[PDB]
Scaffold this active site. Structure first.
Site, PDB file in Angstrom:
ATOM      1  N   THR D  20       0.861  -1.210   0.000  1.00  0.00           N
ATOM      2  CA  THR D  20       0.000   0.000   0.000  1.00  0.00           C
ATOM      3  C   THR D  20       0.887   1.248   0.000  1.00  0.00           C
ATOM      4  O   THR D  20       0.872   1.929  -1.038  1.00  0.00           O
ATOM      5  CB  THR D  20      -0.973  -0.048   1.184  1.00  0.00           C
ATOM      6  OG1 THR D  20      -2.089  -0.847   0.794  1.00  0.00           O
ATOM      7  CG2 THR D  20      -1.469   1.314   1.614  1.00  0.00           C
ATOM      8  N   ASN D  21       5.370   2.189   6.553  1.00  0.00           N
ATOM      9  CA  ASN D  21       5.117   0.862   5.922  1.00  0.00           C
ATOM     10  C   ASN D  21       3.702   0.386   6.278  1.00  0.00           C
ATOM     11  O   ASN D  21       3.499  -0.050   7.431  1.00  0.00           O
ATOM     12  CB  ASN D  21       6.165  -0.176   6.339  1.00  0.00           C
ATOM     13  CG  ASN D  21       6.879  -0.799   5.160  1.00  0.00           C
ATOM     14  OD1 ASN D  21       7.467  -0.094   4.340  1.00  0.00           O
ATOM     15  ND2 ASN D  21       6.846  -2.119   5.071  1.00  0.00           N
ATOM     16  N   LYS D  38      -0.116  -0.976   9.738  1.00  0.00           N
ATOM     17  CA  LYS D  38       0.982   0.028   9.707  1.00  0.00           C
ATOM     18  C   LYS D  38       2.099  -0.478  10.619  1.00  0.00           C
ATOM     19  O   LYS D  38       1.840  -0.652  11.827  1.00  0.00           O
ATOM     20  CB  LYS D  38       0.471   1.401  10.152  1.00  0.00           C
ATOM     21  CG  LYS D  38       1.485   2.539  10.121  1.00  0.00           C
ATOM     22  CD  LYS D  38       0.862   3.876  10.477  1.00  0.00           C
ATOM     23  CE  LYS D  38       1.823   5.046  10.407  1.00  0.00           C
ATOM     24  NZ  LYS D  38       1.130   6.326  10.697  1.00  0.00           N
ATOM     25  N   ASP D 136      -1.857  18.259  10.275  1.00  0.00           N
ATOM     26  CA  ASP D 136      -1.279  17.792   8.985  1.00  0.00           C
ATOM     27  C   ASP D 136      -2.393  17.283   8.067  1.00  0.00           C
ATOM     28  O   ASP D 136      -2.153  16.320   7.306  1.00  0.00           O
ATOM     29  CB  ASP D 136      -0.197  16.726   9.197  1.00  0.00           C
ATOM     30  CG  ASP D 136       0.716  16.529   7.994  1.00  0.00           C
ATOM     31  OD1 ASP D 136       0.902  17.503   7.227  1.00  0.00           O
ATOM     32  OD2 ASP D 136       1.230  15.402   7.826  1.00  0.00           O
TER      33      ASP D 136
HETATM   34  N1  LIG Z   1      -0.258   6.866   7.041  1.00  0.00           N
HETATM   35  C1  LIG Z   1      -1.126   6.172   7.748  1.00  0.00           C
HETATM   36  O1  LIG Z   1      -1.238   6.292   8.973  1.00  0.00           O
HETATM   37  C2  LIG Z   1      -2.004   5.210   7.020  1.00  0.00           C
HETATM   38  C3  LIG Z   1      -2.120   5.003   5.676  1.00  0.00           C
HETATM   39  C4  LIG Z   1      -3.107   3.984   5.342  1.00  0.00           C
HETATM   40  C5  LIG Z   1      -3.535   3.501   4.074  1.00  0.00           C
HETATM   41  C6  LIG Z   1      -2.991   4.018   2.783  1.00  0.00           C
HETATM   42  C7  LIG Z   1      -3.663   4.108   1.593  1.00  0.00           C
HETATM   43  C8  LIG Z   1      -2.831   4.414   0.506  1.00  0.00           C
HETATM   44  C9  LIG Z   1      -1.614   4.891   0.899  1.00  0.00           C
HETATM   45  C10 LIG Z   1      -0.528   5.574   0.143  1.00  0.00           C
HETATM   46  O2  LIG Z   1       0.607   5.627   0.615  1.00  0.00           O
HETATM   47  N2  LIG Z   1      -0.820   6.095  -1.060  1.00  0.00           N
HETATM   48  C11 LIG Z   1       0.176   6.626  -1.991  1.00  0.00           C
HETATM   49  C12 LIG Z   1       0.470   5.698  -3.146  1.00  0.00           C
HETATM   50  C13 LIG Z   1       0.328   6.133  -4.462  1.00  0.00           C
HETATM   51  C14 LIG Z   1       0.597   5.277  -5.514  1.00  0.00           C
HETATM   52  C15 LIG Z   1       1.012   3.980  -5.270  1.00  0.00           C
HETATM   53  C16 LIG Z   1       1.165   3.521  -3.966  1.00  0.00           C
HETATM   54  N3  LIG Z   1       1.583   2.231  -3.716  1.00  0.00           N
HETATM   55  C17 LIG Z   1       0.889   4.395  -2.909  1.00  0.00           C
HETATM   56  S1  LIG Z   1      -1.376   4.599   2.583  1.00  0.00           S
HETATM   57  C18 LIG Z   1      -4.515   2.524   4.056  1.00  0.00           C
HETATM   58  C19 LIG Z   1      -5.086   2.014   5.212  1.00  0.00           C
HETATM   59  C20 LIG Z   1      -4.688   2.463   6.450  1.00  0.00           C
HETATM   60  C21 LIG Z   1      -3.696   3.449   6.513  1.00  0.00           C
HETATM   61  S2  LIG Z   1      -3.054   4.176   7.948  1.00  0.00           S
END
Ligand SMILES: NC(=O)c1cc2c(-c3ccc(C(=O)NCc4cccc(N)c4)s3)cccc2s1
Ligand SMILES: NC(=O)c1cc2c(-c3ccc(C(=O)NCc4cccc(N)c4)s3)cccc2s1
Ligand SMILES: NC(=O)c1cc2c(-c3ccc(C(=O)NCc4cccc(N)c4)s3)cccc2s1
Ligand SMILES: NC(=O)c1cc2c(-c3ccc(C(=O)NCc4cccc(N)c4)s3)cccc2s1
EC number: 2.7.11.1
Lengths: 317, 326, 326, 321
Positions: D20, D21, D38, D136
């Site tokens: 999706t 560390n 996470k 943020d």
């Molecule tokens: N930061 C946090 O506390 C959390 C994030 C999440 C997520 C995320 C969803 C997409 C994410 C991301 O990094 N997108 C960017 C992206 C764009 C394009 C490709 C890829 N692999 C990733 S992180 C999902 C579920 C629970 C949590 S808790």
């Protein structure tokens, strides 16, 4: 107590209502309708009459414009060693309205909205006057001929803030009363919550057979009573063990010791009751659910205030 | 009491990650110094009485643990102990829940499988055997003080805070848990390992039915409920109790005290009315193997719940009983 | 001191002995006329001192495993009850009358079972490992001969708890059980646990598919060589923990391959040469679905047959394996 | 950091099948129900950030047990080789990705922005009930369900109690930084209202509202919309001397630093023109855009005390009509 009889050389009694309450015309006021409550001559009920008279007077005196929905005491007198309280004339109680108009399946959500506001305004006045009613329920709420204005009645229950668990009406009894914790205006706010659910569904929220069953049902909604609250209760030992496990008592007594009660009561599902409502009524029902959730906090200190209740989406939106 | 926080490190090695029990606080931690292995840590309350109780528990757990090096007699394993901010900390093998939680979660408030109860009864009788070999009275055996592994197959007797040497004879009738309190404690007779046998009796019925055997509001009511099963306590037994006068008159009639206005009913006899077999079976229609085991549990309870401790089944007789053997 | 069994003879005034099953102790088939002529198997224990104690241990282990699994989901033999007949302990069992040794003959025709049947048997044996571990029991002699099946051969039950021990007993010497199924930690005299049962199951699963012994070593030394022909030399840290390390390894931790007139070859390493995949497939040609399962069996055997028990797949990881799950 | 591998099992129940560390996993103990795990980096600072995140999410989740106020649900936590691991409801993607895939870098439908606006204000209402600053808020820290109808506020690693006043002007994301944080004034829930303001514009246009190269440039861009910051607000700023002279003139620092001292800033930012853009819109949507602009005007007051309240924002024509 006979029809045609005259009380205080003015009140011509023409009807029964159901202590004794009669309908009479005041000969000294162009035969305007009054209700007269005649209180029993016995020792306990007379001193309870003295109290109800004093509490109504103090509440009437604290609301001269009659905006805060308590029963209007007109005056009092004595007829053959029996105290008689003269009251504004009123049709019936909400117990009767739930039968005749609710047909035992509750009232229109618009009607409950209106009744909710009036009862919250009654709590406001009670708090102002440092008064606990302690027996709020559909039977002790009167309505006018048109059924749109309610008055809270029967203050023979009433006490000053500064002043036990078998005294009033079990189904409307607050958990802090049952465990013997110090209690305030929250007990009246709790009884109102119980009443609101009953006005919409036609049914008792917490139909417990005993104070023990009452706590169990309240905890079926909110989960186990907080330890901090249990500990402040003079009767905690009758309901909780030394480990603060709940003792579920079924009546010969069978006892089940429980570490937790899982919340299982689906308030929204019980309020809806497979009605399939239009969107506008559905929203008001959801808002009653939220209001009830905020009223029925087990800890009095966490309960919605009277002002937050009057300002609640359910009443305002 | 110590309000310990997730991520706090105890004794420079115990990473606290969870809570188990709120009397005393038990926390779940991982041992940084030993491959992040799971431990339970009991933080003892800091007052004079509770730290003295903690040091007594420490001593008793060490004796029981040393007397059972291969861990076959079902008492909780104390790994080690330390001091953190003036609190004694007992480090234990990582057990998750007590039989109180099992009765809620898997019993659904109406008891466990008779075969599970049979295995638990055998395990508790082995703990009774270890306690007696070390001259220790637990004095507070009940579902709340019995722990289980994650699978609920193995139980450990825990909480030696109420424990004593057989000879201390300092248990007064208002100590510990009323419902599991043996009649000899209530009347103030000299007592022994018999009190732990009685509490196990009460526990076994509760494990099968989900219900307290003797739910007395008072010590007086506890005696009434025991005599509802066995009839009036023997005269020879009443005479040996320093508190006989609170419960019996000069004629050794029982005084049934109903409470703050007391009503008293004086009774020459108590008619045995309590029907253990009907209570154990309940509404259930059981397969023949289970129905037999229930009948055998009932016979075992009849031999455990003798009001006279001298007449009570021994630990060895309990283990050799048809319920346990057959 | 065996017991001379007679057909038509009646045991415990209820068991009509009508057939033989196995005798090498004596198992017989019987009808129970006290319970509708229902079929039972009766194991009659030899009356000497060794087997009397061994039969009582078997008895205790079956009751514990049976109690820990009241709905019979975890694949151990069901002990109905026991009795004494002319001073011989008799175990009454649910009426199974075939072991997996016989199934490999009759249905495998000596070249093993359908991969889908092995998959089912593997899940069922992993469930038995789970129940043994939950009860802290080591079977220590798992193999086709000690696994019973129902008449349809859909359900297997682990049996013979006569070799069995508590995990703490640490008493299994390297000549005690069945050499082919004996784990390397037992052979080198290392402290051992549930790992030994996982090892035996791996050996069994191979044999269930091929019909052939995985490690047909003539001796303990040959067993270790065959194990190292698959995985390479046992790790040093593991050799050093072995009480019997000097019987198989020199001071340099070289392996001593003993060919028996004893001939010895001292080896710094052993080349992995055992081709598990080739031996499972074994010039067969299978439909795709079966081919995929055989590869997955291979991957699972690789994870089970780690020489270090601390590196072996857990029971839970085994049940979640692609072979079991997909 | 901890390089987690596909097929690995965490806490003996979470089968990691995807990235999706943050990882995607099936809970083998809860009928393979999906979760996001996470895994917090194993150093001094991140462990305490993870523990703060755990604490802030417990409080928020407990205050909203029916999950109506749009913060991420923390299901539970565990340690794996001394990494704190947070187990969350299994949400699809963040709004940054939604802006790429569905927005095509030119923003979302005004209907979507209206729904999202209401959801974010509900998040603000809960944060304020619990005396928490997120500090943020931006598209990258807002998650969406598979259907993109429900957003959750995530990443409480930046968060603090209202009382802390520990937010220095180089913390968090420059483009979403409220002017009170930049001048070093005492601050409150107003900074999250500001960040939501900045997000809403970005959600409709696809573009940063205040793409300032520096804190000085952020102040200039904000004053390009609203004129010079009020004198009473400047004086209360601990860092006022980095951006304004003794005469309360603004010092415009361009970067080799050159400085232009300015008595006033003429409002030049045409927010309506920027939201409308190239588009010719149905009277239907033109009205919603005019209402968004009005809403943005009430959010982006330079004085925190003059900003629309959360209840005013929820009851604003943009959401209610
Ligand atoms: N930061 C946090 O506390 C959390 C994030 C999440 C997520 C995320 C969803 C997409 C994410 C991301 O990094 N997108 C960017 C992206 C764009 C394009 C490709 C890829 N692999 C990733 S992180 C999902 C579920 C629970 C949590 S808790
Ligand atoms: N309690 C009090 O202090 C007062 C009651 C009243 C009333 C009542 C209206 C309905 C009453 C009632 O008992 N209905 C129940 C009922 C049940 C069944 C049949 C019928 N007819 C009526 S009592 C009217 C005016 C003043 C007072 S003061
Ligand atoms: N007393 C002792 O000496 C010890 C207890 C333990 C425990 C416990 C397991 C469950 C406990 C409990 O209080 N459950 C009841 C409960 C009730 C209500 C809620 C929850 N979560 C749990 S305490 C674990 C490990 C070592 C010790 S030593
Ligand atoms: N070991 C034990 O404790 C038990 C074994 C059993 C069995 C057996 C099934 C077949 C057996 C066997 O020896 N087959 C091999 C074989 C080999 C050669 C000829 C024939 N007929 C059979 S033993 C059945 C029921 C209960 C028990 S308890």
């Amino acid at each position: 107590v006979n029809i045609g009889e005259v009380l205080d050389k003015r009140y011509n009694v023409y009807g029964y209502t159901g202590s004794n309450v009669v309908r009479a015309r005041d000969n000294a006021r162009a035969n305007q309708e009054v209700a007269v409550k005649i209180i029993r001559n016995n020792e306990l009920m007379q001193k309870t009459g003295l109290k109800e008279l004093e509490f109504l007077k103090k509440l009437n005196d604290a609301d001269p414009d009659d905006k805060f929905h308590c029963l209007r005491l007109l005056r009092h007198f004595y007829h053959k060693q029996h105290l008689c309280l003269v009251f504004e004339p009123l049709s019936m109680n909400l117990r009767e309205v739930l039968k005749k108009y609710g047909k035992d399946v509750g009232l229109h959500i618009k009607a409950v909205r209106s009744y909710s506001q009036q009862l919250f305004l009654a709590l406001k006045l009670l708090k102002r006057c440092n008064i606990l009613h302690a027996d709020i329920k559909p039977d002790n709420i009167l309505v006018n001929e048109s059924k749109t204005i309610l008055k809270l009645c029967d203050f023979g229950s009433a006490s000053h803030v500064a002043d036990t668990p078998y005294l009033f009406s079990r189904f409307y009894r607050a958990p802090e009363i049952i465990i013997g914790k110090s209690y305030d205006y929250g007990i009246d706010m709790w009884s109102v919550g119980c009443t609101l659910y009953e006005l919409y569904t036609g049914k008792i929220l917490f139909p417990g057979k005993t104070n023990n069953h009452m706590l169990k049902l309240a905890m079926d909604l909110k989960g186990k009573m907080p330890n901090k609250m249990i500990r402040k209760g003079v009767f905690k030992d009758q309901h909780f063990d030394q480990n603060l496990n709940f003792m579920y008592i079924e009546v010969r007594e069978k006892v089940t010791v429980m570490s937790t009660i899982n919340p299982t009561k689906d308030l929204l599902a019980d309020l809806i009751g497979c009605q399939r409502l239009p969107e506008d009524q559905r929203k008001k029902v959801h808002q009653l659910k939220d209001l009830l959730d905020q009223i029925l906090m087990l800890d009095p200190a966490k309960r919605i205030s009277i002002n937050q209740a009057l300002q609640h989406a359910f009443i305002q939106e």
